[PDB]
Design a protein around this nucleic acid. Structure first.
Lengths: 49, 48, 417
DNA sequence: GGCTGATCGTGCAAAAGTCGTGCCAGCCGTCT
DNA sequence: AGACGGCTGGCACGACTTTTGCACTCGACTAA
């Protein structure tokens, strides 16, 4: 990383034209996600992390 | 004058420099909407 | 029979061992206990908006970023400025070194001259001395910000240059000998240097409340002190009535056995939890009985307390008392303090008094606070104050308490009046 | 055999730690 | 300008605290 275009790459966009929508697939959903939640816990008040 | 975070500072700097050029970006509210749709079992994406 | 103290006979074993469930109950885990209970309830199946904050405070990181955007700089210069902004402490100092910054740049074209120029530009910012990482550097920048018309400016600059050590030790005589400055005229310059706003970046930090949830609440309104635990914080488990009403009706031996085992485990856990709650309430009542004397006597005259003394006030073993005292907090009108904070060592005093270490430290701190700034109280001089108190104490060991209160050395605490 | 199942079960103790208080070695501020 | 003086500060031995690592054999039989 040379860090000059690294910041520049943050500000980028596509044409975004002709958006569609259809049904979903579970494997696609896993692709969208990066991890799975497994506890109902949200936040700790002991350390606020 | 909207949620485009990258556009607000750009426009402010342009006005300070007297550029008067408008850079669109793409509103973050649309991103929120897209994430909400994806939160459902719904496939949606933006093509080219 | 008869009354006697013969020492040879038969006996039995001590208290029966392997009470792991009771051992866990004796220790207080607070929310961790709640998490363990949640895990067990997951294991045991027979147990049971439009308004948003919407705040985008800059925190001076966004302010610094806006200043960088609003300032004219090259792409390499802008990247260097952003990297510098990344390594900024909350107090307003640079966390990383200049050589560290250059290494993080990882550019052969990047040079120390460019880093110095950026730092000068970084110094050229509001507030002055941004990410200086050096008190003298930040102080020098702040002094350079002001005009030269003010008196004692060059002398203050000279002192900030290389005379910081004498001020650190408050070595006024040594500083006068070295710098050859005007006597007692340097006091005004010292005061002005004290009026330099150290850590100017501290204003960026915004206060955030510390959510402290007490366990026991005490009112003592019009006397009649009554210890009450936080009912909201009190855990409560429910038995699955629908599951309860399906055990006998089951025609499967395996299902019935599983239901019976789950019910027995849930009953044992509920009994353990109730026993722990009752023991905690009893311990709190006993402590409040002891603390009532302490509360009336006040923090300065707090009485010494022993773990065995409290264990006597209860019927359980002192091990249970120690386990319960762990992770124990309570709320009182005076304030909220840990249960273990009540206990303190007993210092032999004149007339045979036993003096609480914490109370002795508090009284010593109060006395030291009421001391002449020109002449700080000496540790040997503290023996005179202790004698005036009418209670014997350990002045030699009193330095340990003084350091515990983070009290600076009396010689180091000496300053011009 | 092979543990095998089970009333009923509110410390304890023992090595470990930790502090209380004093006790000696150095050090600078100083004035002879 | 070298020595008293109180500080400072760690090191030591007693003196209070403390945590964890600990479940027999039942009363069912169990018979080869």
């Amino acid at each position: 990383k040379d860090l000059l275009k690294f910041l520049k790459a943050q500000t980028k966009t596509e044409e975004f034209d002709a958006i569609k929508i259809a049904l979903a697939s579970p494997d696609m959903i896993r692709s969208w996600s990066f991890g799975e939640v497994k506890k109902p816990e949200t936040i700790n008040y002991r350390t606020f992390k | 004058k909207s949620d485009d975070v990258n556009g607000r500072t750009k426009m402010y700097k342009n006005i300070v420099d007297g550029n008067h050029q408008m850079e669109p970006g793409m509103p973050e509210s649309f991103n929120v909407l897209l994430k909400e749709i994806r939160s459902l079992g719904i496939n949606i994406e933006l093509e080219d | 029979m008869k009354q006697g103290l013969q020492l040879r006979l038969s006996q039995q074993l001590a208290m029966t061992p392997q009470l792991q469930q009771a051992i866990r109950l004796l220790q207080l885990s607070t929310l961790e206990l709640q998490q363990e209970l949640q895990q067990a309830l997951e294991s045991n199946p027979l147990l049971e908006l439009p308004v948003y904050q919407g705040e985008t405070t800059q925190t001076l990181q966004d302010y610094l970023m806006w200043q960088v955007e609003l300032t004219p700089f090259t792409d390499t210069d802008r990247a260097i400025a952003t990297s510098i902004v990344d390594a900024v402490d909350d107090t307003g100092y640079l966390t990383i070194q200049i050589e560290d910054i250059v290494d993080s740049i990882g550019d052969d074209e990047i040079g120390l001259e460019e880093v110095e120029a950026v730092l000068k530009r970084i110094q050229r910012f509001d507030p002055v001395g941004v990410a200086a990482k050096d008190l003298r550097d930040c102080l020098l920048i702040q002094l350079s910000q002001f005009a030269k018309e003010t008196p004692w400016l060059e002398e203050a600059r000279l002192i900030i240059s290389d005379h910081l050590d004498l001020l650190a030790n408050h070595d006024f005589r040594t500083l006068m000998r070295v710098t050859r400055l005007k006597e007692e005229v340097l006091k005004e310059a010292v005061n002005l240097i004290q009026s330099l706003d150290p850590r100017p970046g501290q204003s960026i930090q915004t206060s955030e409340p510390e959510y402290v949830i007490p366990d026991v609440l005490v009112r003592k309104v019009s006397g009649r002190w009554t210890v009450e635990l936080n009912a909201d914080s009190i855990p409560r488990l429910k038995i699955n009535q629908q599951y309860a009403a399906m055990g006998n009706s089951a025609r499967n031996d395996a299902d019935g056995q599983f239901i019976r085992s789950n019910l027995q485990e849930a009953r044992w856990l509920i009994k353990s939890l109730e026993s722990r709650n009752d023991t905690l309430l009893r311990v709190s009542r006993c402590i409040v009985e002891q603390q009532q004397a302490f509360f009336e006597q006040g923090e300065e005259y707090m009485k010494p307390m022993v773990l065995a003394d409290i264990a006597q006030a209860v019927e359980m073993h002192e091990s249970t008392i120690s386990r319960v005292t762990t992770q124990k907090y309570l709320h009182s009108p005076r304030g909220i303090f840990e249960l273990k904070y009540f206990f303190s060592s007993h210092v032999n005093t004149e007339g045979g008094g036993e003096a609480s270490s914490t109370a002795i430290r508090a009284l010593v701190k109060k006395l030291i606070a009421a001391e002449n700034p020109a002449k700080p109280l000496s540790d040997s001089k503290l023996t005179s104050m202790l004698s005036e108190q009418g209670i014997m104490v350990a002045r030699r060991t009193v330095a340990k308490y003084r350091e515990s209160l983070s009290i600076p050395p009396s010689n180091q605490r000496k300053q011009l009046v």
